[model samples]
Target: DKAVIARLRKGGEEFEVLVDPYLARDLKEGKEVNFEDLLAAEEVFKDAKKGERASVDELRKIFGTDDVFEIARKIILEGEVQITAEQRREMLEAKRKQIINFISRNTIDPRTNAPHPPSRIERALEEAKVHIDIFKSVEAQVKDIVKALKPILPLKFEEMEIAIKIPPEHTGRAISALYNFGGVTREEWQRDGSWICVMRIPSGMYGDLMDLLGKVAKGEALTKVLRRIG
Candidate 1:
């Protein structure tokens, strides 16, 4: 029991002693030890006076570790990671493909808009790619930036609805519009060269949609057009 107490006390003293060897030695040496002593105890610090000797250099070389200084640095620099826009775009594209393939194959009914039979319902997951791509492009890239740039005034339309009769010549425009506009869906063909498209645009963008649809209606449009206002 007595030996244990002596060892415990010795260990405690050793810890305190090791904490600041340079400072302790400086005090014994009757050298100018003040703020520098306290600072040397921190492993990773710029020397208070350049060219002043580092106290922990030997510790780092011997232990092959910067345990004291580096740990403090890790704590201070936590939660700070940055990625370039290019990196983010690459990540989104990779994730986008996985979603597109899944939705294309799994549509409940490839021809109809209704949910597919239970046996075919598994294909619904394929829509995940469509949903994510649309969200990233329309919501994140377009709508959010527009909202931020616009004046903060009383605005109407949380949901702006539009319908446009697309001509046979502008089939590609209709397809692109469906993807650009919110909830833009095409129904099964009632006749050749006839399609009913229902789409929602942000109320803020209604004017833009109107101008876009006018081009489509006048046959001046290159792609699909919105026909009705809902």
Candidate 2:
């Protein structure tokens, strides 16, 4: 059935809304619908008695918020919506494209330390048989997807530990550079006011990290690689 009941609840208040059957299913399955889709759905504001239709302004009043983005976010995150197979396929395709674009921008060839062409990344994905799940968030799948592509290309998704020591005179500027490179696992402030940090970052990004450090520290910073994990 294309018509289904959706229940939305927050802060001890609840209400039922008529929504597309597919959207109801998607909501039950914990999938998110786009904000614009929520606003444009035919039955989003269909009322039970006399078939009253609520306008966007009325919806804002009903939701107790003046912000459209908040309302849309609540609709998808806090309310239930339906999803169909075709919708799922479309979402999956869009997510796949997002994943490819992200990898092309952030990743590099381990051997050459250069960004892989988008076409090459696409081919590597196809060759690796990486399965993108529509129900999973894109960020959650990136590491696994990159791991799968490693064997098919000169890709490195492995983390490398970096140990760095910055002179006291340059500590302030150098600290921010460390954070930009990767997450800090350990940090220490020396008696002489120098900064020491151990960070973990993607192996392919090691070169970039070094370049940044060189620019900021100007050979005054001492750095060493402690370990690499794929």
Candidate 3:
């Protein structure tokens, strides 16, 4: 079992514990986990690295509950994990690749309507001075980064396959608009007289699509993004 420190503070005191990385993963992934070895030390500390033991009574008052398992569970659920700089940079690098790949796959040159290669995307991000948020998910930051790239690069990002459903009455007008965007890639007419079509559109124009659909279908149109592509 890999040992890692889980940390959270409450009641004017800091709480820290050693946990098995496997237990940490299970707690995050969610499972019928045991408390038996979840705490690698079964010892709560006010300062783990400094070797100061935090009394059990301190935990009982601070967490509003007791038991090593329950306390450990809370720490795993709501605490910060201490990771090495090497691991930190490793994650940052991986997340960078994820952002780069996402940009290359889901974006294209507005001038040529062709994908700018990953190399160019990577270069332009540097040229554009975009900083990746290692703690944030790729989707959460792509839009902001894409906006940042605009002055230095001509990039057009689009939403991937979005499955939209329309009542038969609204299908005619909706499909016509869909044709103007990214024409239906997949279309199906349902038994209940509704049409389901999956289409993609320029990300910037998503607002226009939603506004038009609201007008045409009175908000009856259903939309599910099948590919945020991040």
lDDT of 3 by residue, 13-124 (tens): 7888888755564565455677777777877888888889877677777876667778877877788867567666876788789999888767767665457777888899
- Clashes by residue pair, model 3: none
Q: What is the TM-score of each candidate against the true structure?
A: 0.30, 0.54, 0.55
Instruction: Give residue 162's lDDT in candidate 3 (0 to 100).
Output: 74
Identify the runs in model 2 with alpha carbons over 4 angstroms from their true place: 1-94, 101-119, 126-134, 139-151, 154-156
**Greater-lDDT candidate between 2 and 3:** 3
lDDT of 1: 0.37
Full candidate order by lDDT, most accurate first: 3, 2, 1
Q: For residues 1-230, could you state the per-residue lDDT of candidate 1 as single tens digits?
A: 10000001111221111123333323323345453332334533232223233346543553345565433223222311122455447645654454333332222221332222332322332432223332132223423322332342111224434555566666666556656645665544436675556565544344555566665555543333344232
Off by over 4 Å in 3: 19-43, 49-56, 67-80, 160-230
Which wins on TM-score, candidate 1 or candidate 3?
3
Overall local distance difference test of candidate 2: 0.67
Evaluate model 3: give its lDDT.
0.76
Question: Each candidate: how many clashes?
Answer: 13, 7, 0
Ranking by TM-score: 3, 2, 1
